[PDB]
Amino acid sequence: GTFENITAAPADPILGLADLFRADERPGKINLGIGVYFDETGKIPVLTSVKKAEQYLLENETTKTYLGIDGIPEFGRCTQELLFGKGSALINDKRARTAQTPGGTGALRVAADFLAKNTSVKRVWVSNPSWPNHKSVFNSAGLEVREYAYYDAENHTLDFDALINSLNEAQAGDVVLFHGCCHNPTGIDPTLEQWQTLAQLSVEKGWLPLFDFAYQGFARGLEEDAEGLRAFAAMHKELIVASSYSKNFGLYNERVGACTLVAADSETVDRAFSQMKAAIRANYSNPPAHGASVVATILSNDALRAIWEQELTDMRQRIQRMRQLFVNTLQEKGANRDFSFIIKQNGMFSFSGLTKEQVLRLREEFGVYAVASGRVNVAGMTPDNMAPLCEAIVAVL
Amino acid sequence: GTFENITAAPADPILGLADLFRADERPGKINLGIGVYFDETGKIPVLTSVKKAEQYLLENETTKTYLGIDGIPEFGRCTQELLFGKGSALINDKRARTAQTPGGTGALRVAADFLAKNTSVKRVWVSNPSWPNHKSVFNSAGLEVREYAYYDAENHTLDFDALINSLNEAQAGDVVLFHGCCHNPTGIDPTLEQWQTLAQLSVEKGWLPLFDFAYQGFARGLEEDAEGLRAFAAMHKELIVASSYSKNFGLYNERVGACTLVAADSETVDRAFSQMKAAIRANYSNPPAHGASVVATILSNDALRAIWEQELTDMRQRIQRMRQLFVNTLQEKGANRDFSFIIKQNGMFSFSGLTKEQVLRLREEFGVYAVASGRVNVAGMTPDNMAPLCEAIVAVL
Ligand SMILES: Cc1ncc(COP(=O)(O)O)c(C=O)c1O
Ligand SMILES: Cc1ncc(COP(=O)(O)O)c(C=O)c1O
């Protein structure tokens, strides 16, 4: 038997949680686990701009014939404008090529396979903590993953001194991964000035920067959230950007992402991009059309784009109000520990500072589900579940 | 500079040809390369069943939240019934687990990654000739690819004796890849007795069968086309099926496929399937929903399924009329070679027998695009383009 010697795989630290949640029969459960946006009703809605775009596609699509390996051309162009700016020199010099991929995960995997097979890259540096699936994606391509320090769990801030020192041994030709904004899971991003410091250090040490952009528009705005990347783009010959539209378009299950390659000149990037397409061909051949067609339609239509931007602002602002309400209700419910750092953190997630033991208590005694690392999805909080949630947390403090 | 010394990849023998066709400006160009279905009009249509299912989805979808790693459950259930039949013992014994994948290609890569990372398998056997991308997929997962004989070019038939003497070099624990029906590119499939011979030889030699099922329904029928797979399934304890809905549903660019895992018992397949989900998680996380939702909606609704089964029947029969028309028209245009063997070949493709130089001549001089191996897409032939097509072929004989 070929399958007899197989060892079972552990449950995913995030998706295994959602399986335990679907089984729990207790009334009043609260899901603060997976990173999806809930509305004030506690539901995960389809955006109006997306429904409008899907109607246009239903009426106007005449064929489902294969896309090119790199996907919808307009999708790649609108992606580069979103990341680098409408009039970026990167775009005018034709230094960037973008492949449409199945979600942000697929973009990271395409980059990993491309690097492992066509470059001397052997090592990727990832923040500690980070998205748990980062290590698995790069390991799947045979790349060693090291960790650099990031979070000051005492002051609930960026430990910039430890970050610099821990990256001292990152060699020229190593890949260093940066969260573009809304760091997962800490919600603490570098300031513009810290970005500029990292950009200078990156060029001096010869790192290959890889930016993971899964939450553009959830911190401050579409343009502001990209300031760090554009500070790097102004100084580097080469970099890679894995972006995702799962969160900011609410297109999670349609798998809409992009992997953007940047090189010194158009001739080099075209040569490298041909090898990236070869790695896509051997993986999934060509990308799924529906989700990317939606995004390209919205971003190309000025009227639909204005709808989406307002819907994104509504999502970002509801999350910020839930942060404030979360802190206030914890006080009202009698918490003596100070949770005001929550209001400083950006995006969907925040390191609550709860121990694995307290997270386990919340899940089994109170039906409140969070990731074992203490990460809670603030976007899962509503005016209706806020008080029971806070009463449960205060109970385990 | 990390990208400066990368070597450009060669063009894909199929998709590179498609790019040349799009760029060609002559109005009379004929595309017989990529495996997509054309109607008598010369367009690549969307099936009516698909359009109706998409309209249902547009009006009833309330969320785009992530699917499970293995995708839509009903999709997996309906896939297993198509492959093994309604009352299969594999299904009742719970020996089979299916993961929804991005296309058939994605199913192949998932299986390859799963095998290379969790088993001792190191060698995959693929027919000569075969789909060109088979080698790329398995090599990229780190598996060695060996070739066994299949096609008798002299008699334009299956060389069942060479096939066997070749596969005797295949050891136990090796993976042997079989086209379930409509062999690509030859269109010559084993008979039911030859399948049963290979099945017995397979269990006797200890091979792990891997079936590529991209054209179920294009040879004889949905059930008839699965006879070979069901002969293997009745004897083996383990096998893998990579299937695609790109062709038989015309959902090429939505990437709808499945990877079905079979083990000796329910406990072993679940253990093995857990590692397959891990390989998926580190690739694209979870599969695209739109295409698989369409498939599951059509197969779950009796009215829609009846429409789809008739649309698939019309596709299969139009291709059969073009095979007849193609052979007769060649005689009328002055071909002295005998092309009767084309009538005995199944599916969309036919091994024309033209040389690489003749194929090159057809493209450059006559604007007729075929794969360099001489494979032509019969489904690209229409009554309108038949006469110019055959006139060009006769002119290079
Ligand atoms: C930092 C980061 N990268 C990538 C992803 C995955 O994105 P996607 O669901 O589009 O594959 C996520 C969220 O799941 C994330 O937080
Ligand atoms: C034999 C065979 N296997 C797999 C595939 C992959 O199909 P898909 O487009 O679903 O990836 C194809 C054609 O594309 C094929 O002909």
mmCIF file of N, CA, C and O and ligand atoms in Angstrom, chain A residues 66 284-285, chain B residues 102-106 108 131 134 179 184 212 214-215 244-247 252 255-256 349, ligand 2:
data_model
loop_
_atom_site.group_PDB
_atom_site.id
_atom_site.type_symbol
_atom_site.label_atom_id
_atom_site.label_comp_id
_atom_site.label_asym_id
_atom_site.label_seq_id
_atom_site.Cartn_x
_atom_site.Cartn_y
_atom_site.Cartn_z
ATOM 1 N N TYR A 66 -10.353 29.831 -22.703
ATOM 2 C CA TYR A 66 -9.235 30.021 -21.788
ATOM 3 C C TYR A 66 -8.677 31.436 -21.854
ATOM 4 O O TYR A 66 -8.490 31.999 -22.935
ATOM 5 N N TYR A 284 -1.573 25.426 -12.399
ATOM 6 C CA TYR A 284 -2.999 25.429 -12.710
ATOM 7 C C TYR A 284 -3.294 25.876 -14.140
ATOM 8 O O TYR A 284 -4.464 26.094 -14.477
ATOM 9 N N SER A 285 -2.267 26.032 -14.977
ATOM 10 C CA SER A 285 -2.422 26.302 -16.404
ATOM 11 C C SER A 285 -2.796 27.753 -16.691
ATOM 12 O O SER A 285 -2.051 28.459 -17.377
ATOM 13 N N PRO B 102 -8.638 23.862 -9.210
ATOM 14 C CA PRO B 102 -8.732 24.762 -10.368
ATOM 15 C C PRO B 102 -8.371 24.067 -11.670
ATOM 16 O O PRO B 102 -7.208 24.063 -12.089
ATOM 17 N N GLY B 103 -9.370 23.473 -12.314
ATOM 18 C CA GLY B 103 -9.172 22.785 -13.569
ATOM 19 C C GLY B 103 -8.563 21.408 -13.386
ATOM 20 O O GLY B 103 -8.180 20.990 -12.291
ATOM 21 N N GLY B 104 -8.486 20.681 -14.501
ATOM 22 C CA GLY B 104 -7.810 19.396 -14.482
ATOM 23 C C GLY B 104 -6.322 19.534 -14.229
ATOM 24 O O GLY B 104 -5.722 18.708 -13.537
ATOM 25 N N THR B 105 -5.705 20.577 -14.786
ATOM 26 C CA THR B 105 -4.295 20.828 -14.511
ATOM 27 C C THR B 105 -4.055 20.952 -13.011
ATOM 28 O O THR B 105 -3.148 20.318 -12.459
ATOM 29 N N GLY B 106 -4.872 21.760 -12.331
ATOM 30 C CA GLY B 106 -4.733 21.891 -10.891
ATOM 31 C C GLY B 106 -4.862 20.564 -10.169
ATOM 32 O O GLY B 106 -4.151 20.305 -9.195
ATOM 33 N N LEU B 108 -3.986 17.705 -11.381
ATOM 34 C CA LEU B 108 -2.739 16.985 -11.619
ATOM 35 C C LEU B 108 -1.633 17.474 -10.692
ATOM 36 O O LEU B 108 -0.905 16.664 -10.107
ATOM 37 N N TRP B 131 -0.409 14.561 -23.660
ATOM 38 C CA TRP B 131 -0.554 15.996 -23.465
ATOM 39 C C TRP B 131 0.803 16.581 -23.081
ATOM 40 O O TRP B 131 1.411 16.115 -22.107
ATOM 41 N N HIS B 134 1.859 17.326 -19.328
ATOM 42 C CA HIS B 134 1.971 16.289 -18.305
ATOM 43 C C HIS B 134 3.382 16.242 -17.730
ATOM 44 O O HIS B 134 3.567 16.189 -16.509
ATOM 45 N N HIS B 179 -5.004 7.958 -19.787
ATOM 46 C CA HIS B 179 -6.117 8.765 -20.269
ATOM 47 C C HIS B 179 -7.379 7.913 -20.202
ATOM 48 O O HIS B 179 -7.432 6.830 -20.795
ATOM 49 N N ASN B 184 -5.299 12.075 -25.660
ATOM 50 C CA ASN B 184 -4.704 13.271 -26.231
ATOM 51 C C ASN B 184 -3.238 12.997 -26.515
ATOM 52 O O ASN B 184 -2.487 12.724 -25.566
ATOM 53 N N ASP B 212 -6.280 10.448 -15.892
ATOM 54 C CA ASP B 212 -6.574 11.804 -16.342
ATOM 55 C C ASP B 212 -7.863 11.750 -17.155
ATOM 56 O O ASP B 212 -7.911 11.099 -18.204
ATOM 57 N N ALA B 214 -10.321 14.211 -18.792
ATOM 58 C CA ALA B 214 -10.649 15.552 -19.254
ATOM 59 C C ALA B 214 -11.756 15.588 -20.300
ATOM 60 O O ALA B 214 -12.221 16.681 -20.642
ATOM 61 N N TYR B 215 -12.204 14.433 -20.804
ATOM 62 C CA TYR B 215 -13.138 14.410 -21.924
ATOM 63 C C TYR B 215 -14.260 13.402 -21.713
ATOM 64 O O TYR B 215 -14.758 12.814 -22.680
ATOM 65 N N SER B 244 -11.596 16.926 -15.208
ATOM 66 C CA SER B 244 -11.812 18.308 -15.602
ATOM 67 C C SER B 244 -13.220 18.474 -16.148
ATOM 68 O O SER B 244 -13.742 17.586 -16.828
ATOM 69 N N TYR B 245 -13.825 19.620 -15.845
ATOM 70 C CA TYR B 245 -15.094 20.017 -16.438
ATOM 71 C C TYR B 245 -14.918 21.140 -17.451
ATOM 72 O O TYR B 245 -15.912 21.703 -17.920
ATOM 73 N N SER B 246 -13.676 21.477 -17.800
ATOM 74 C CA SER B 246 -13.442 22.542 -18.768
ATOM 75 C C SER B 246 -14.096 22.233 -20.107
ATOM 76 O O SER B 246 -14.724 23.107 -20.716
ATOM 77 N N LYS B 247 -13.968 20.993 -20.580
ATOM 78 C CA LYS B 247 -14.393 20.657 -21.933
ATOM 79 C C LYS B 247 -15.876 20.306 -21.984
ATOM 80 O O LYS B 247 -16.635 20.894 -22.761
ATOM 81 N N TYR B 252 -13.991 26.613 -19.639
ATOM 82 C CA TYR B 252 -12.534 26.561 -19.699
ATOM 83 C C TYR B 252 -11.899 27.536 -18.714
ATOM 84 O O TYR B 252 -11.074 27.142 -17.880
ATOM 85 N N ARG B 255 -11.919 27.283 -14.601
ATOM 86 C CA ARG B 255 -11.030 26.343 -13.926
ATOM 87 C C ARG B 255 -11.785 25.452 -12.947
ATOM 88 O O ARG B 255 -11.723 25.656 -11.729
ATOM 89 N N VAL B 256 -12.479 24.449 -13.477
ATOM 90 C CA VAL B 256 -13.317 23.549 -12.695
ATOM 91 C C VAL B 256 -12.781 22.140 -12.902
ATOM 92 O O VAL B 256 -12.876 21.589 -14.007
ATOM 93 N N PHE B 349 -9.583 15.630 -30.937
ATOM 94 C CA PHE B 349 -8.328 15.688 -31.666
ATOM 95 C C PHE B 349 -8.154 14.481 -32.575
ATOM 96 O O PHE B 349 -8.789 13.437 -32.402
HETATM 97 C C1 LIG C 2 -5.524 15.019 -21.295
HETATM 98 C C2 LIG C 2 -5.707 16.339 -20.605
HETATM 99 N N1 LIG C 2 -5.508 16.428 -19.246
HETATM 100 C C3 LIG C 2 -5.677 17.635 -18.605
HETATM 101 C C4 LIG C 2 -6.048 18.772 -19.315
HETATM 102 C C5 LIG C 2 -6.201 20.043 -18.513
HETATM 103 O O1 LIG C 2 -7.476 20.615 -18.677
HETATM 104 P P1 LIG C 2 -7.868 21.920 -17.823
HETATM 105 O O2 LIG C 2 -8.057 23.059 -18.794
HETATM 106 O O3 LIG C 2 -9.137 21.686 -17.043
HETATM 107 O O4 LIG C 2 -6.735 22.266 -16.881
HETATM 108 C C6 LIG C 2 -6.255 18.701 -20.698
HETATM 109 C C7 LIG C 2 -6.627 19.901 -21.536
HETATM 110 O O5 LIG C 2 -6.574 21.034 -21.067
HETATM 111 C C8 LIG C 2 -6.083 17.466 -21.330
HETATM 112 O O6 LIG C 2 -6.265 17.340 -22.683
#
